[PDB]
Design a protein around this ligand. Structure first.
Ligand SMILES: [Fe+2]
Ligand SMILES: [Fe+2]
Lengths: 335, 335
């Protein structure tokens, strides 16, 4: 992640090591480049991450904070997630029927922005362990002023990018507001992503698709599909031996930086400790349609594994049988 | 060495007897165990060899081959050794001044990886007797990708091991790439060693320190110090009668296996014939510091003999006098 950058006007270090959580694996830096740099386009075209420092993608939102947002976003309701710890356990509600024993670890809740702002205060007053994360799409369903800021994003840049990479439609666009210390555990998404930081700092640790064997994702039919089964804060090396070979790409993004997270790449995101609240807006695009050229890329093998798991759960008429069948196929035959 | 192991997926025998060279002495198997097995720690603590089959020590390098390496290791220069035969005659350049008559039998040469890859091809095209061996330390002086693979080694395992055995610092870390048929003649090293096989198969024949009398190492001041004077392919029983009593410990290591070669143990290493190129990475640690408890271990007597030879060469002001003086001390007095 490197030596903390110095803020303009001698305001000092943007952050210091004591704000970063400690992990068991090594990491090297993600390149930090200007969007006009030919190396930045090269990295994106080859689907490798890059932090673009001067896109002006969310320029108007740089002034956003809780006051400004509460006072201009509207009286609509927002999805707020809460967790007993720093780690947010998200899950797919639609898959809970496949695992009756799964007990949810995170709760969503609809509330008004000021209610969110107020619940935030208390947790700071008492200092409880509870944490929250607000997540909402940028529609026209929000305040007029927020809509103007939104219209002011650099759509020229991102649209051009979307066009040259061959990506599909902008599938999702989320505003995220979190508390210092918040951590979104490692997982991968099937879409291309531009992560635009707005307020505060977030440490992003990415792992290429070829580390599948070291990250142990949950069964595709499980509510936590696409998330790593390993507890980064207490890795169980007996159940997940290859987590000892994992190597990541790291960076700390701040106001104005845009991080490109290529599709299928794992990412672990954390809001720096004692760094104040964080605000980010993500942009997701469907990747480009498959051209079959060999040798296959790692993410294409991951896609094949996901498909085999899905087909099996349908053919057997019950996802709980997938594992027993796979083991039967392999033992004494391929292992 | 036992019955050749069968590779997963019915790919057949990993190797067959016809690939092993024939020798005049008998050998028994080195234990092949899991690193979680209590017997494996017992063997290492008592300084006996063991092949650990599941450490994941060099997991990321299992994908390495010439293409991958040439294309990612860099444009630096590598030490390549060549030999007219299958046996590589290594020597200590600094001791050549003690034996003016010593004429080197192996040559080193600095070249770029693709140059190494190309010279390799020719020797296969023409089928010459010439052979090569590439040897290089794993620094940061190598390509970025190779550095990531390297960072992905299971440092947690080896460091823990280094800690519990009381060993000193990791003194050396070498990458070795050789040709089928290559043989490194018997010799001992003064450091602890973990030999991690990556590609291809190597037959390793070890001899405990107490076989000193049957292996006849060269005089300590000679360029071939620590190497056996006996030609394993044509033992001279008149000059080395006790080579008829030698008994070894043997094993064939393959991708994923890690062989512990305790300090002072002799080892003879050969790349299976018609087995393709071999790749290995070795790790060397200084042994633990001497605690003097009796009865002395064999390697401690070897250390004493080496010291007497060294002191004598200094006291007499010339290493060539060591032998005449030792004979004078012994004849009609201790023999
Ligand atoms: Fe994500
Ligand atoms: Fe050696």
């Amino acid at each position: 992640s490197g030596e903390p950058r110095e803020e303009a006007g001698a305001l000092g270090p943007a952050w210091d090591e004591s704000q970063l959580r400690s992990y068991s694996f090594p990491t090297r830096p993600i390149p930090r480049l200007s969007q006009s740099d030919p190396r930045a386009e090269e990295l994106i075209e080859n689907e490798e991450p890059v932090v673009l420092t001067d896109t002006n993608l969310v320029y108007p939102a740089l002034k956003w904070d809780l006051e400004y947002l509460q006072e201009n976003i509207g009286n609509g309701d927002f999805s707020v997630y809460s967790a007993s710890t720093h780690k947010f356990l998200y899950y797919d509600e639609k898959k809970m029927a496949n695992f009756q024993n799964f007990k949810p670890r995170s709760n969503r809740e609809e509330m008004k922005f000021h209610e969110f702002v107020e619940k935030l205060q208390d947790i700071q007053q008492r200092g409880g362990e509870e944490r929250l994360y607000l997540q909402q799409t940028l529609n026209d369903t929000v305040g007029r002023k927020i809509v103007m800021d939104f219209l002011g994003f650099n759509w020229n840049w991102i649209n051009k990018q979307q066009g040259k990479r061959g990506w599909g439609q902008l599938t999702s666009n989320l505003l995220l507001i979190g508390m210092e210390g918040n951590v979104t555990p490692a997982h991968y998404d099937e879409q291309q992503n531009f992560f635009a930081q707005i307020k505060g700092y977030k440490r992003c640790i990415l792992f290429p698709p070829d580390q599948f064997e070291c990250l142990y994702p949950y069964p595709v039919h499980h509510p936590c599909d696409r998330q790593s089964q390993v507890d980064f804060d207490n890795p169980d090396y007996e159940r997940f031996p290859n987590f000892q070979n994992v190597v990541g790409y790291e960076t700390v993004v701040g106001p104005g930086d845009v991080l490109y997270i290529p599709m299928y790449w794992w990412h672990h995101i954390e809001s720096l400790l004692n760094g104040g609240i964080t605000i980010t807006v993500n942009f997701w695009y469907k990747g480009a349609p498959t051209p079959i050229e060999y040798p296959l890329k790692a993410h294409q093998k991951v896609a094949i594994m996901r498909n085999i798991e899905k087909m099996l759960g349908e053919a057997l008429g019950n996802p709980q049988e997938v594992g027993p069948l796979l083991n039967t196929m392999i033992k004494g035959r391929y292992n």
